[PDB]
Amino acid sequence: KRITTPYMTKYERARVLGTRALQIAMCAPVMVELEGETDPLLIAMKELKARKIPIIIRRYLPDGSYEDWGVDELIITD
Amino acid sequence: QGRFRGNLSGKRVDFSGRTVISPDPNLRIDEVAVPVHVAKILTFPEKVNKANINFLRKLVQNGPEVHPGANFIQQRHTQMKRFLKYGNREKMAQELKYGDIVERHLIDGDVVLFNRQPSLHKLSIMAHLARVKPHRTFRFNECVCTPYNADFDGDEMNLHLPQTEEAKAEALVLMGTKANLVTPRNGEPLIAAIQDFLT
Amino acid sequence: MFVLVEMVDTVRIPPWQFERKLNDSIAEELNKKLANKVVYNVGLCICLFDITKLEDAYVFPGDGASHTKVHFRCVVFHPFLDEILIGKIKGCSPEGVHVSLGFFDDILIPPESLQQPAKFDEAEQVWVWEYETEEGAHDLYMDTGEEIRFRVVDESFVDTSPTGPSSKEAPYTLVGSISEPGLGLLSWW
Amino acid sequence: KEQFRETDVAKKISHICFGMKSPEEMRQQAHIQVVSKNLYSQDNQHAP
Amino acid sequence: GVSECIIMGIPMNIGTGLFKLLHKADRDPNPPKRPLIFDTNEFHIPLVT
Amino acid sequence: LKPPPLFPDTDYKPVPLKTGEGEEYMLALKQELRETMKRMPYFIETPEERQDIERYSKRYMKVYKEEWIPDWRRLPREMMPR
Amino acid sequence: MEVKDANSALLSNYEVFQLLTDLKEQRKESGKNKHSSGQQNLNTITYETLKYISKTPCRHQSPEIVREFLTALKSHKLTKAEKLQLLNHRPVTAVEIQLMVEESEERLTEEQIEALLHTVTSIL
Amino acid sequence: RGRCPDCGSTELVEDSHYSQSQLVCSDCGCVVTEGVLTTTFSDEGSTG
Amino acid sequence: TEGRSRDGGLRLGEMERDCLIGYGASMLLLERLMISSDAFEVDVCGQCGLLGYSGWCHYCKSSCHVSSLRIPYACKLLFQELQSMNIIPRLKLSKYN
Numbered sequence: 010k011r012i013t014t015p016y017m018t019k020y021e022r023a024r025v026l027g028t029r030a031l032q033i034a035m036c037a038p039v040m041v042e043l044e045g046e047t048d049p050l051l052i053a054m055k056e057l058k059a060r061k062i063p064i065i066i067r068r069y070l071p072d073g074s075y076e077d078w079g080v081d082e083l084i085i086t087d
Numbered sequence: 088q089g090r091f092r093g094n095l096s097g098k099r100v101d102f103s104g105r106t107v108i109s110p111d112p113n114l115r116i117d118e119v120a121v122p123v124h125v126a127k128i129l130t131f132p133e134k135v136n137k138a139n140i141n142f143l144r145k146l147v148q149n150g151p152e153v154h155p156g157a158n159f160i161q162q163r164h165t166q167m168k169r170f171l172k173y174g175n176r177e178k179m180a181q182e183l184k185y186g187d188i189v190e191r192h193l194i195d196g197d198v199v200l201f202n203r204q205p206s207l208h209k210l211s212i213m214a215h216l217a218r219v220k221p222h223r224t225f226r227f228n229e230c231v232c233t234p235y236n237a238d239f240d241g242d243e244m245n246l247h248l249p250q251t252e253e254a255k256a257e258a259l260v261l262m263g264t265k266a267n268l269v270t271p272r273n274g275e276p277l278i279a280a281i282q283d284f285l286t
Numbered sequence: 287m288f289v290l291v292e293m294v295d296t297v298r299i300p301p302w303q304f305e306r307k308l309n310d311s312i313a314e315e316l317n318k319k320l321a322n323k324v325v326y327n328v329g330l331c332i333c334l335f336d337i338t339k340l341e342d343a344y345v346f347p348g349d350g351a352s353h354t355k356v357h358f359r360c361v362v363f364h365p366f367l368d369e370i371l372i373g374k375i376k377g378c379s380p381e382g383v384h385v386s387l388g389f390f391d392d393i394l395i396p397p398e399s400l401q402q403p404a405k406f407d408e409a410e411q412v413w414v415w416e417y418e419t420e421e422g423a424h425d426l427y428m429d430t431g432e433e434i435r436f437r438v439v440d441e442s443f444v445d446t447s448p449t450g451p452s453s454k455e456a457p458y459t460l461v462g463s464i465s466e467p468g469l470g471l472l473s474w475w
Numbered sequence: 476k477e478q479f480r481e482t483d484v485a486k487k488i489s490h491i492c493f494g495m496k497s498p499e500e501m502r503q504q505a506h507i508q509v510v511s512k513n514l515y516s517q518d519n520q521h522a523p
Numbered sequence: 524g525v526s527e528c529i530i531m532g533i534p535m536n537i538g539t540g541l542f543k544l545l546h547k548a549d550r551d552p553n554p555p556k557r558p559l560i561f562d563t564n565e566f567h568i569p570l571v572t
Numbered sequence: 573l574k575p576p577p578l579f580p581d582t583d584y585k586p587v588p589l590k591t592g593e594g595e596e597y598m599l600a601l602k603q604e605l606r607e608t609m610k611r612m613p614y615f616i617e618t619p620e621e622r623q624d625i626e627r628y629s630k631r632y633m634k635v636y637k638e639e640w641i642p643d644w645r646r647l648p649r650e651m652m653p654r
Numbered sequence: 655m656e657v658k659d660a661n662s663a664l665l666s667n668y669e670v671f672q673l674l675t676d677l678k679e680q681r682k683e684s685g686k687n688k689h690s691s692g693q694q695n696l697n698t699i700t701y702e703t704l705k706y707i708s709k710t711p712c713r714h715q716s717p718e719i720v721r722e723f724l725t726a727l728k729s730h731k732l733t734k735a736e737k738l739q740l741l742n743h744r745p746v747t748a749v750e751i752q753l754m755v756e757e758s759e760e761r762l763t764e765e766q767i768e769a770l771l772h773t774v775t776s777i778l
Numbered sequence: 779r780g781r782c783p784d785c786g787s788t789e790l791v792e793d794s795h796y797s798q799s800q801l802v803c804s805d806c807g808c809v810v811t812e813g814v815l816t817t818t819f820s821d822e823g824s825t826g
Numbered sequence: 827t828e829g830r831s832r833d834g835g836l837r838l839g840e841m842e843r844d845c846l847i848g849y850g851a852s853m854l855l856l857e858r859l860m861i862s863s864d865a866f867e868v869d870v871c872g873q874c875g876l877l878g879y880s881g882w883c884h885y886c887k888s889s890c891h892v893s894s895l896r897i898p899y900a901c902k903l904l905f906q907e908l909q910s911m912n913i914i915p916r917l918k919l920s921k922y923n
């Protein structure tokens with residue numbers, strides 16, 4: 010059974026927002042509706058608050074094992 | 088000056104500037120106001136897509152003269168770098184395809200770093216939110232002055248502007264002023280009120 | 287001639303295509319990449335037979351496209367020794383008769399593979415054969431092709447790779463045989 | 476007809492391996508020898 | 524070492540470089556095989572001694 | 573200016589061979605033996621592998637071989653030829 | 655890319671023809687996207703193979719035909735090569751089988767040959 | 779380069795807004811749509 | 827280049843490469859130091875482990891072993907620099923996964 014913390018760390022927030030912003034900048038599918046938005050990163054933060062992002066982080070332990078957690082499934086906070 | 092300590096760890100950089108600083112209390116504690124004559128020079132290589140298309144048409148109509156304007160275009164279907172001094176620009180607003188590149192100026196609300204030279208500790212470099220104003224010197228709120236230890240005696244400040252989304256995001260989330268109020272040494276708070284507020 | 291082969295590979299899908307199931311997109315792309323090519327050791331591929339493994343879809347810093355590793359299975363054209371074949375005549379030369387299946391064309395049949403009683407022509411390009419007492423000492427074939435029968439007896443792979451700093455052969459060829467007793471003119475046999 | 480070509484392979488450095496070269500290895504690496512003490516033509520063109 | 528990474532120009536280990544991202548992609552692993560009929564051991568068990 | 577040739581000339585030239593009969597016989601016996609003893613099962617070439625498809629020709633022109641017979645009382649335990 | 659096995663399996667002409675038939679089933683069932691000439695290349699190769707394979711005798715065979723043939727001709731001392739190539743030929747005379755059967759007279763006899771010929775001619 | 783994106787440019791000249799090096803071209807009142815960064819010397823230290 | 831007299835932009839000494847690590851950002855550091863500044867691409871041959879050019883290894887006299895990498899130009903300079911002193915940094919290449 011998963012052992013790592015159930016919260017998302019600063020670094021995970023940063024990288025997931027970054028990569029989803031890169032994706033959204035291109036024509037990748039989008040799920041949250043947008044109020045005239047124009048910047049990728051704002052779309053990214055909107056979705057993250059909506060927990061709509063299609064990503065799974067695969068945390069690595071030092072010995073090669075790993076866990077997976079759903080971004081929609083971690084504990085999130087401002 | 089040798090190889091390593093020269094151009095391996097000390098590599099120089101472009102998309103940057105330098106200028107004098109002066110106070111401006113009437114802004115928030117998370118914005119730095121760049122001068123207009125610098126916002127025409129640092130440019131962001133945006134990528135046009137379904138959502139943002141029409142805005143960038145508005146920019147490309149302008150040319151390099153009006154502040155919100157652009158300087159170069161690069162195209163998906165051919166990777167040439169047209170220069171907006173030339174040509175009937177409005178047509179090139181129509182010719183855009185998703186995946187093309189347009190190099191826009193700085194626009195109000197763009198993540199931009201900021202720095203003071205004699206780095207001593209983590210906080211000597213931060214990530215503000217940009218704004219444009221007609222004078223010729225970097226202006227920001229004075230509460231942030233203790234971290235930098237800057238004093239408006241005639242100092243110089245550098246400035247950078249990243250070029251890839253993931254880098255932009257890391258600059259905002261980690262290096263934002265609002266996430267770095269306490270110093271990481273002992274938990275003391277540094278960003279606070281100053282002379283003439285304390286009175 | 288048609289033979290199955292087992293493959294593995296890694297492939298990416300640009301980030302403007304996640305709107306569709308990955309199995310389908312990997313099918314298209316993997317097809318497009320192999321499409322109508324020779325493999326150095328096994329010859330001309332036709333198409334995939336089926337996929338069997340779709341490893342997880344990684345994403346990499348600076349690239350929006352996901353990256354995935356695959357196990358899959360493909361069909362390739364490899365005739366094996368002495369095997370009996372049917373092919374259109376592709377042409378003629380003193381070095382041998384030319385043969386093709388329309389979709390594939392790299393077959394030759396030299397005079398040693400030709401039937402015995404005659405092994406040269408009237409010096410005209412078309413091969414004209416002879417028999418001992420019957421037959422008109424002239425029977426021949428035509429380039430646009432009759433589907434003749436032949437036995438594969440030799441092959442060759444040749445490296446068409448480039449050499450030296452950057453900036454007539456074909457990689458894969460076969461040899462057939464028609465001289466066997468009971469074999470020869472298709473109008474006759 | 477065409478033989479399949481690997482267009483590219485995404486690659487990454489694994490290790491550096493420091494070591495010496497022999498006189499014969501040095502020959503094999505070189506493109507040309509240089510056997511002259513002078514560098515330019517004596518003419519006006521200053522050609523190498 | 525991270526210093527090496529600065530020398531070599533590739534992302535470091537610590538920080539946001541420490542973990543990986545997998546796409547939440549519409550994917551079926553080990554999808555049903557395409558059958559074949561020509562070959563089975565029942566047909567092709569060798570006849571040699 | 574112009575680097576010399578790869579092979580500079582030589583004033584001397586190698587002494588010619590001396591003729592000798594029993595030595596020439598030996599010369600002949602050398603080229604005979606080097607081709608002869610390669611048959612001895614101490615010599616090894618690659619084992620047979622990678623046949624196309626079972627064709628009863630392989631039954632008729634089959635290759636014959638039987639495992640070697642070293643001295644089982646002189647080498648360490650694992651010496652069994654298999 | 656790597657090849658785990660370049661000699662994974664042989665196949666009967668119907669197997670590839672069956673694949674070709676189901677492949678032409680979806681022929682241009684997608685939209686008029688016209689992505690690249692690779693579309694044209696695969697169309698050319700597949701259509702030309704199908705069209706030529708249409709000229710082969712093994713057209714219109716059936717899976718149960720194949721399997722029942724295999725079971726029927728199991729006892730005739732044949733090799734995999736003989737079995738598969740014969741299924742790929744459907745012969746009509748004893749001349750060509752001697753071409754196909756190595757050491758024919760040392761192994762078989764004309765009555766077995768006739769039984770095989772009748773069975774293959776009728777079944778396929 | 780040489781051309782503008784497609785048509786009849788063949789010449790190259792320098793121009794630049796701000797501390798840069800871009801290759802003016804003169805079939806389009808353009809910069810060969812390319813530019814290249816000049817490389818130069820100094821901060822160290824007629825024939826023999 | 828150097829500075830304002832000759833159009834040199836800015837310098838980012840070691841003491842800011844330290845703060846970037848302090849925060850722990852990685853893509854920012856990578857960008858700022860090799861993408862934006864002086865990114866360049868080079869070619870190597872896996873078989874011998876030496877550098878080449880234009881898709882060809884002059885050492886091995888072969889084509890099937892060369893490949894192209896990204897690299898900070900300063901480090902390519904350094905690899906061409908050591909060899910003069912007969913210290914040869916041979917390379918072993920690997921899959922990117």
Ligand SMILES: [Mg+2]
Nearest residue numbers: 238239240242
């Ligand atoms: Mg001061």
Ligand SMILES: [Zn+2]
Nearest residue numbers: 785786805806
């Ligand atoms: Zn023109």
Ligand SMILES: [Zn+2]
Nearest residue numbers: 871874883886
């Ligand atoms: Zn090499």
